[PDB]
Structure formats: C-alpha cells, structure tokens
Short mmCIF file of C-alpha atoms and ligand atoms in Angstrom, two decimals:
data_model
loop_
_atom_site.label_atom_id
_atom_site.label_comp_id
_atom_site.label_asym_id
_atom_site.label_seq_id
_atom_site.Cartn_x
_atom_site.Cartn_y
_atom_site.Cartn_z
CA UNK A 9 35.58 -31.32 9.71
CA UNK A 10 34.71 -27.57 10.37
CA UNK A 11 31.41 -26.73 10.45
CA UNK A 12 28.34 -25.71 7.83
CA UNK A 13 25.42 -26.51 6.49
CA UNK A 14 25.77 -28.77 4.49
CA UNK A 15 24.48 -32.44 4.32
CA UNK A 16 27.53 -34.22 6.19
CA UNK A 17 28.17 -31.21 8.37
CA UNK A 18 25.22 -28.78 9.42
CA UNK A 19 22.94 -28.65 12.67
CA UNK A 20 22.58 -32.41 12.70
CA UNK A 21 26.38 -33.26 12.96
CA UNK A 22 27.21 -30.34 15.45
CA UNK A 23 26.76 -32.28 18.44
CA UNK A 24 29.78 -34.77 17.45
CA UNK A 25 32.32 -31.49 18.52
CA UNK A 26 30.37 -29.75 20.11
CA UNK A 27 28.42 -31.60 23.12
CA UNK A 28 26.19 -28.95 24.29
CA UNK A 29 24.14 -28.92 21.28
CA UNK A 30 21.84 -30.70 23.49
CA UNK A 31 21.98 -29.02 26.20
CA UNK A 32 18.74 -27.10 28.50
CA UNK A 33 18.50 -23.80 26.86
CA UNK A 34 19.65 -24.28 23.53
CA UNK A 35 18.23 -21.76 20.48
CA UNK A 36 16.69 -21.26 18.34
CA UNK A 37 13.09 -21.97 19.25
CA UNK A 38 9.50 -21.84 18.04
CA UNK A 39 7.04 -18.95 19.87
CA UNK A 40 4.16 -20.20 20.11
CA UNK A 41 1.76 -17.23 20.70
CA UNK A 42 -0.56 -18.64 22.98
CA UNK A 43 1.58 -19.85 25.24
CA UNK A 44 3.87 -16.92 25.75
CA UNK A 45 3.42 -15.50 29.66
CA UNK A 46 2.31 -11.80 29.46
CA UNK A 47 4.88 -9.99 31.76
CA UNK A 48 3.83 -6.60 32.48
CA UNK A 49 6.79 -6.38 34.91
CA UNK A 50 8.90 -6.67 32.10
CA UNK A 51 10.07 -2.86 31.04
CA UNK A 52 10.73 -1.16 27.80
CA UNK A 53 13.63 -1.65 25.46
CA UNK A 54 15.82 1.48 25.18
CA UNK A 55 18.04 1.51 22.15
CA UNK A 56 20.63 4.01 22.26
CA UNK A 57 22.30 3.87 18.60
CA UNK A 58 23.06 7.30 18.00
CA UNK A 59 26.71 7.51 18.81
CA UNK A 60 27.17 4.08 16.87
CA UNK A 61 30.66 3.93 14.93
CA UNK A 62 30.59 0.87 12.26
CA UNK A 63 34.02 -0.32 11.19
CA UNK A 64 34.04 -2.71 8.90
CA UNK A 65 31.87 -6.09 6.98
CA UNK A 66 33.13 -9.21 6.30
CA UNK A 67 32.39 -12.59 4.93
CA UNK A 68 33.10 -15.39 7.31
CA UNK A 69 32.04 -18.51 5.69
CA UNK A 70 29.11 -18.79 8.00
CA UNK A 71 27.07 -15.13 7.15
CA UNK A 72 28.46 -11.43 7.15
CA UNK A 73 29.09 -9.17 9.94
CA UNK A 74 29.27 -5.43 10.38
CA UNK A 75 31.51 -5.20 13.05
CA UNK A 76 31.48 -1.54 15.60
CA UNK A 77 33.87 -0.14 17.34
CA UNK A 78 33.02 -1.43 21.04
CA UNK A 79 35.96 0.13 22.96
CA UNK A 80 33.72 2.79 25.02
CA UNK A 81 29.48 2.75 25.29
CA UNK A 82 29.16 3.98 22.40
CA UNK A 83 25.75 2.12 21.01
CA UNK A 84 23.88 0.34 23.72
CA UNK A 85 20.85 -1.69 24.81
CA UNK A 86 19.19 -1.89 28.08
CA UNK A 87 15.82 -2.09 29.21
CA UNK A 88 13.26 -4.95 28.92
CA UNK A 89 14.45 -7.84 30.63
CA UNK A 90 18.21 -6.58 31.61
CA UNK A 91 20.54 -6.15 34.20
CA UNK A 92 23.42 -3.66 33.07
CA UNK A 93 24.80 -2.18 30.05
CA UNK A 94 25.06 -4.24 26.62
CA UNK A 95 27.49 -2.88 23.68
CA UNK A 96 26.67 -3.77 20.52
CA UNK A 97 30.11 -5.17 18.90
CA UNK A 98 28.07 -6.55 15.36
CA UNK A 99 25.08 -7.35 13.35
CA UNK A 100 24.64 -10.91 11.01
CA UNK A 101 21.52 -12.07 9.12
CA UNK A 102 20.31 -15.71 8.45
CA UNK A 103 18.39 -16.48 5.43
CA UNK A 104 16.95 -18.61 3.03
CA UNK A 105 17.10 -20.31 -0.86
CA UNK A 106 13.63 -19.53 -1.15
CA UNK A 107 10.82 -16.72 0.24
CA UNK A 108 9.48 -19.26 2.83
CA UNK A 109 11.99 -20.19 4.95
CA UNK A 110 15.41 -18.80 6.20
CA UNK A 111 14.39 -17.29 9.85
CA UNK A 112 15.65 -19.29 12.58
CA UNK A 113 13.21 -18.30 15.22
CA UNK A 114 9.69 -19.43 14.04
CA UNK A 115 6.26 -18.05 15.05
CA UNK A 116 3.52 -20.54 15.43
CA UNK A 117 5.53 -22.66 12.91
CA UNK A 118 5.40 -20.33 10.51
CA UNK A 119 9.16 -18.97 8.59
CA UNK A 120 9.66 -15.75 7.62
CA UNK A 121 12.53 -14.93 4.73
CA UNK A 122 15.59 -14.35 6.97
CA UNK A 123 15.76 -12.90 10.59
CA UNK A 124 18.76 -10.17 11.64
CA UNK A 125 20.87 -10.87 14.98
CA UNK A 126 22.27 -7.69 16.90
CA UNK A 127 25.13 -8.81 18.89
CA UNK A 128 25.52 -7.25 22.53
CA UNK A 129 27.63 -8.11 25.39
CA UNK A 130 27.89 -7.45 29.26
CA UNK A 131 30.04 -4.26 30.57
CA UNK A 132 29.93 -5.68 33.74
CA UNK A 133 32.37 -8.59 32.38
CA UNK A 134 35.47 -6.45 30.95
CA UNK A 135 35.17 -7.66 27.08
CA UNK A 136 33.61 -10.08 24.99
CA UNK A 137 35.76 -12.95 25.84
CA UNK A 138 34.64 -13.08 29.51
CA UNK A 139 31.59 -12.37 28.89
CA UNK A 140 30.58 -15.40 26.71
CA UNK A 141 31.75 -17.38 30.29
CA UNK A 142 28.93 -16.04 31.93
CA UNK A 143 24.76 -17.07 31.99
CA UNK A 144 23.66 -13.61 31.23
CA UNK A 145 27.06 -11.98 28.86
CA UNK A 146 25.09 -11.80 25.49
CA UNK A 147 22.27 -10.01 24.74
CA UNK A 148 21.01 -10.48 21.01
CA UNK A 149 18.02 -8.68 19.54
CA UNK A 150 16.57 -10.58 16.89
CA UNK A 151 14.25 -9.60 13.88
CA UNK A 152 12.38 -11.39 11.18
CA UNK A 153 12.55 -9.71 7.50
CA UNK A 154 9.35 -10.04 5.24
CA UNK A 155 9.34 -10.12 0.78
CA UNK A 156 7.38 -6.87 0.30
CA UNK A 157 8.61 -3.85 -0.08
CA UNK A 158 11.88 -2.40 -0.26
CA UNK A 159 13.48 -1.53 3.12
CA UNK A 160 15.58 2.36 2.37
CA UNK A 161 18.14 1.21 5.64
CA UNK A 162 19.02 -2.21 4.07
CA UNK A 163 20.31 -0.67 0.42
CA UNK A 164 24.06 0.27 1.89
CA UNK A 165 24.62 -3.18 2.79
CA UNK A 166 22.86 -4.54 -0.52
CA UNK A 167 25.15 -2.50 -2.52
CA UNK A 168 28.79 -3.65 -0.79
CA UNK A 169 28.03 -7.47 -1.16
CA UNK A 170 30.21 -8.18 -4.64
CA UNK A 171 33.49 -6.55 -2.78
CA UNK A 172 32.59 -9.63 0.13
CA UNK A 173 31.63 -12.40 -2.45
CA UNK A 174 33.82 -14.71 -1.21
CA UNK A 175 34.98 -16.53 2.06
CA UNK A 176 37.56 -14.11 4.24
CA UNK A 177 36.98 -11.07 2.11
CA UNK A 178 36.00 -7.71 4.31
CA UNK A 179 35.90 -4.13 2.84
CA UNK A 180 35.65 -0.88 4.84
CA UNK A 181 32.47 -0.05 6.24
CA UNK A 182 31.97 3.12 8.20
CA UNK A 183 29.18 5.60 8.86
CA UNK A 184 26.40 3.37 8.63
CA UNK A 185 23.44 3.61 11.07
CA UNK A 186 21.77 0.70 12.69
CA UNK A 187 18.28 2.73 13.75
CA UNK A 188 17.24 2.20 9.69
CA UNK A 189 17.31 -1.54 10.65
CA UNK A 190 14.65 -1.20 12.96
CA UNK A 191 10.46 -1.56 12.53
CA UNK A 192 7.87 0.92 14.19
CA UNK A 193 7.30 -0.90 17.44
CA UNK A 194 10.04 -2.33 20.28
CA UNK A 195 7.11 -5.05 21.40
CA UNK A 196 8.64 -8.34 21.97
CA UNK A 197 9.02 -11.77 23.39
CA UNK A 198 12.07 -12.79 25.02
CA UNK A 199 13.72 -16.47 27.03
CA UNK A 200 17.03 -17.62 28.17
CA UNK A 201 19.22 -19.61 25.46
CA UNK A 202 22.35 -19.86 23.59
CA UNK A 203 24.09 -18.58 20.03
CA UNK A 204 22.63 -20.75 17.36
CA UNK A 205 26.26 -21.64 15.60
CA UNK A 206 29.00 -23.08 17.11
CA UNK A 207 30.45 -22.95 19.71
CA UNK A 208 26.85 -22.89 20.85
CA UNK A 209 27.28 -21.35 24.07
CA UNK A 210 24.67 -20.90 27.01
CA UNK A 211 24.94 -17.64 27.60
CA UNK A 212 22.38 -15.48 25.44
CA UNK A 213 19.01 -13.34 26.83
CA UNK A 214 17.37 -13.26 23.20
CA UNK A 215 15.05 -10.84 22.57
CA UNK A 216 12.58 -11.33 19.70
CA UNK A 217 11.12 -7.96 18.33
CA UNK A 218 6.89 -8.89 17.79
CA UNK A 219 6.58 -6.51 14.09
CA UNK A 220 8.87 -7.73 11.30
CA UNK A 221 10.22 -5.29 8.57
CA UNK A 222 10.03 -6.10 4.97
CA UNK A 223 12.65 -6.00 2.33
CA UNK A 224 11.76 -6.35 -1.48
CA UNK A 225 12.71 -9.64 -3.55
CA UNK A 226 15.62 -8.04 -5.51
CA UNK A 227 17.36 -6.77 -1.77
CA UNK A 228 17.10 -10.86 -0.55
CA UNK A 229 18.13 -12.20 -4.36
CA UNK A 230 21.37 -10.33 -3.54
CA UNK A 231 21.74 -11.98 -0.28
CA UNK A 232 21.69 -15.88 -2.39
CA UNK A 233 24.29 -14.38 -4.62
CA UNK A 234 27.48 -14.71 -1.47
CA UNK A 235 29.30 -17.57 -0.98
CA UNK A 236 30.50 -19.90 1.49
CA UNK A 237 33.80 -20.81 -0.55
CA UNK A 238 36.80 -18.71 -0.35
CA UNK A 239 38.27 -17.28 -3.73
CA UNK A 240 39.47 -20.06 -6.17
CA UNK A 241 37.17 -23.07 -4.99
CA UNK A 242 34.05 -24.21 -6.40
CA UNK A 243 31.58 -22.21 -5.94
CA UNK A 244 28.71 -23.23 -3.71
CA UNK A 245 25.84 -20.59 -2.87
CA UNK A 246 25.55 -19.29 0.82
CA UNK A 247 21.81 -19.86 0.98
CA UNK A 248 19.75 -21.83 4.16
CA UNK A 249 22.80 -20.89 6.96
CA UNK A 250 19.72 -21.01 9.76
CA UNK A 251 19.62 -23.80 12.60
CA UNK A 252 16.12 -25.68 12.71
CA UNK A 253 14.20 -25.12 15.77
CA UNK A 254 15.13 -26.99 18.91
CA UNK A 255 13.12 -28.16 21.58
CA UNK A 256 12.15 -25.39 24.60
CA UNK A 257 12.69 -27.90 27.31
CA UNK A 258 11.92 -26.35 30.90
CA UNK A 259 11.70 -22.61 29.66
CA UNK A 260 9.00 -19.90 29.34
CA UNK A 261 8.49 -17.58 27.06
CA UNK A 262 7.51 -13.84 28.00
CA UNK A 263 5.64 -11.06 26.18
CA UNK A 264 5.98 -7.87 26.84
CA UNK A 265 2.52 -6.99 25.05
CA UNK A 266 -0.88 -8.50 25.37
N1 FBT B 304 23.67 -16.17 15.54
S1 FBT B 304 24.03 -15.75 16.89
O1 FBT B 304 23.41 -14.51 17.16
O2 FBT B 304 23.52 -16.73 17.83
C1 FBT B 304 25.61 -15.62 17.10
C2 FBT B 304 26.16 -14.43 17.71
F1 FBT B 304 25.34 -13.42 18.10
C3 FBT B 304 27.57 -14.29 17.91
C4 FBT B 304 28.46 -15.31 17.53
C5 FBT B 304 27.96 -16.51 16.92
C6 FBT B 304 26.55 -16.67 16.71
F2 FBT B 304 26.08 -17.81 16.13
HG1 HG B 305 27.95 -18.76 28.82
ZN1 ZN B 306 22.84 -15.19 14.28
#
C-alpha cells in the first residue's frame, strides 16, 4: 500500500513500487574510515544561513519538516564538492526507539541516536521539481546527533512537537535559525547517491559532517512521543523511520580531512 516502516511495508518492500531501490548509487551507506580517499582538492563548505526565513513544520507521516521560504537565495550552501548555488527549502531528522540506533548513515558500523538531513537544491535547474530530474539537483548535508548533553538550538523544535502529534498536522514556524543546528567543525566525508525514502531518486551529492552534536535524553524522548497515524486512528509511535545501510557498489568515499 503506501509506504512505512513497518513489517509488511518498510525498506524491504520498497523495491515492489519503486524499482530503483536497487539501483548503483543508492543511500544510505556505511563510512568506513579507512577506506575513505583523502581529497585535499576538495574545498571548504560555506554555509550562508543568515538571511534564512523558516515558514512553517509539519508532520508528514514519514518525519517532520521545517520548511523555508526558497523563492530568492536566501540561505545557501556551496563549497566542498559543488558546482553552483544550493537553497535550502527544509530540514527532517531520522531517529530511533532506543539510544543505539536511529542514524541512517553509519560509521564503521557503529549507530548514532538519530542523524538531521538539510535539504538543498540546484539554482541552475529553475525549482525543485526539475531539479530532482537531474544527477547533481540535491545537495543534503547530513549530521549524526549524540545522548549527552542538551543541545540550546534544538529546544524550539522540542517545544512545538504536541501542536504536530499527529499525521498532516503543521503549525506556524517562523524566525528560527538553522546555524544553532550546527557542531564546531564543517570536516566531512561526502559520495554520490540518492534520497533514502521514496521515491528514492538518484540525484543527491550527500555530504556527511565528521563531529556529531549531542542532544540530552529528555530532547530525543520527545522525538518517540509523534506519530505516524493521523488524528482518530490507533495510535502507533513514530520511532525507527531510518533506511538500513545499502551496499556502496562502484563508489568512493572522500574526506575532506586527514
Ligand atoms: N531523507 S532525504 O534527505 O533523503 C530526503 C530528502 F532530503 C527530501 C525528500 C525525501 C527524502 F527522503
Ligand atoms: Hg535525479
Ligand atoms: Zn532524510
């Protein structure tokens, strides 16, 4: 039927509708560290979120997204390994039912908590629907979250999750600043793949940030308390929405750091 993650219908079944679910440069995959090329051709990110306008958030069924207003270049990313200018349009997490696992990306095996996706896409291509018809439209900059302590940035969203509790739901969501979301350091790994839900899409440069930033156990417990039903179903918890690692096939995997 429509996609989850559930027994009959998660990652496994995908590739019934779907088709390219086993396709070349699928994601997400494992980094193994020793393996990674070292690419000092490779330049630095630049992250230019000041004049970032957030609209709204909303629960989808799948994860929430804070959605920005991508009508002019207002928050960008360039840099590191692209070509152009990338607008951010939104931001979505993946996590876990328990501390040691939720991350979709893995580093030498290991699972982190949950792991935050910012969405970018091409200028170049006119507007987001052309550009996910194109090898290099989306540019997603990925980061693992840690249980330790609390992160300051991560609170405003904490706090507006029971007005999105349930499937569809989406309350107003301005002013909010996407530079508390970010650790110290912009080191990182990056390799050619595709979005890691449906419709699965080859069209992704992911870029995996090296230094994870930690949230406390309370800010994740709220995350386990959304759900993927809409108001007046049963309610089932939206907890492990993360694909399982798929295999790296012909690719490479370069670090910008040594
Ligand atoms: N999770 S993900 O980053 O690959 C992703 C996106 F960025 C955008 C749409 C769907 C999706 F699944
Ligand atoms: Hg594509
Ligand atoms: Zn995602």
């Amino acid at each position: 039927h429509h996609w989850g993650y559930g027994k009959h219908n998660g990652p496994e079944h995908w590739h019934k509708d779907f088709p390219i679910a086993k396709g070349e440069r699928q994601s997400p995959v494992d980094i193994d560290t020793h393996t990674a090329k070292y690419d000092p051709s490779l330049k630095p990110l630049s992250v230019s979120y000041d004049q970032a306008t957030s609209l709204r958030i909303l629960n989808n069924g799948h994860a929430f997204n804070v959605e920005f207003d991508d009508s002019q270049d207002k928050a960008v990313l360039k840099g590191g390994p692209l070509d152009g200018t990338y607008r951010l349009i939104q931001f979505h997490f993946h996590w876990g039912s328990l501390d040691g696992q939720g991350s979709e990306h893995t580093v030498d095996k290991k699972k982190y908590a949950a792991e935050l996706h910012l969405v970018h896409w091409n200028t170049k291509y006119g507007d987001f629907g052309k550009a996910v018809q194109q090898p290099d439209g989306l540019a997603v900059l990925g980061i693992f979250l840690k249980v330790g302590s609390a992160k300051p940035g991560l609170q405003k969203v904490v706090d507006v999750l029971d007005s999105i509790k349930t499937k569809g739901k989406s309350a107003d969501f301005t002013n909010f600043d996407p530079r508390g979301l970010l650790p110290e350091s912009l080191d990182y790994w990056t390799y050619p793949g595709s979005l890691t839900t449906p419709p699965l899409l080859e069209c992704v440069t992911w870029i995996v940030l090296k230094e994870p930033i930690s949230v406390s156990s309370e800010q994740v417990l709220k995350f386990r308390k959304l759900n993927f039903n809409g108001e007046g179903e049963p309610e089932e918890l939206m907890v492990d929405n993360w694909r399982p690692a798929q295999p790296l096939k012909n690719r490479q995997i370069k670090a910008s750091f040594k």
